[PDB]
Amino acid sequence: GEELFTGVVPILVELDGDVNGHKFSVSGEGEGDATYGKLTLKFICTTGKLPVPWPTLVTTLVQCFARYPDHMKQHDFFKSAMPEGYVQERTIFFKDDGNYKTRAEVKFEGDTLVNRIELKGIDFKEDGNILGHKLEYNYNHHKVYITADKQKNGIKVNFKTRHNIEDGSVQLADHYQQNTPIGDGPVLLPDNHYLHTHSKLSKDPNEKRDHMVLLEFVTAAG
């Protein structure tokens, strides 16, 4: 499981989404280097303009790339599910607004780590922060709390994210996350701990399509 992540791994992401009826797709390619906890990825909205802000999509758009320090390698659930993979399900509640519901499969396809996702968004306000496109194009750092869930043979994960708005306030998002394996094979069920994540968003100046360039570093602690 862990031996598939010793070098640079290529990554592919495929998202089909539906938010308040506005349908879209996003595709991403990049690579991940789990020894350093590094991800570099470029995403394109392939159906035109993206109907929600790119920041709301980041957490949906591969925690198996987290750097687990040596003293904690016995708590890396995500790499232990590989190569067959795990299913990731979330509900994300945006305070005073709507919510996303997501299901993704993460697994190897030959050499490539694949993250295939379905997303549904309901109850968003036409003039709210999301559909109204009022979020800044940036990303704060976060702690992602991970607990075992032994009766689903996986893990439960919860965190909040704070998205900046031009007026100084924030849009809060509360994530609730269940990961479970795809295989009938062994996995590691960790002790409680968290992931510390840093993310930088930017644009390719030679790209005319609606896109996002993403640099992420993720580290396990606690």
Residues engaged in binding Ni ion (CB under 5 A): 141
- For Ni ion, the nearest residue by Cβ is 141
Residue with smaller CB distance to Ni ion, 141 or 203: 141
Residue with smaller CB distance to Ni ion, 95 or 141: 141
Residue with smaller CB distance to Ni ion, 97 or 216: 216
The H or E element spanning position 93 is strand 86-94
What are the angstrom distances between the C-alpha of 103 and each of 72, 91, 156, 188?
28, 9, 14, 22
* Whole-angstrom distance, CA of residue 94 vs CA of residue 60: 14
Q: How far is the CB of 196 from Ni ion (least distance, A)?
A: 6
What are the angstrom distances between the C-alpha of 161 and each of 35, 60, 111?
25, 12, 32
Q: How far is the CB of 46 from Ni ion (least distance, A)?
A: 33
Length of the chain: 222
Residue with smaller CB distance to Ni ion, 104 or 214: 214
Q: How far is the CB of 163 from Ni ion (least distance, A)?
A: 18
3-state secondary structure of 2: helix
Q: How far is the CB of 217 from Ni ion (least distance, A)?
A: 9
In this structure, what are the phi and psi dihedrals at residue 21, rounded to the nearest 5 degrees?
Answer: 95, -20
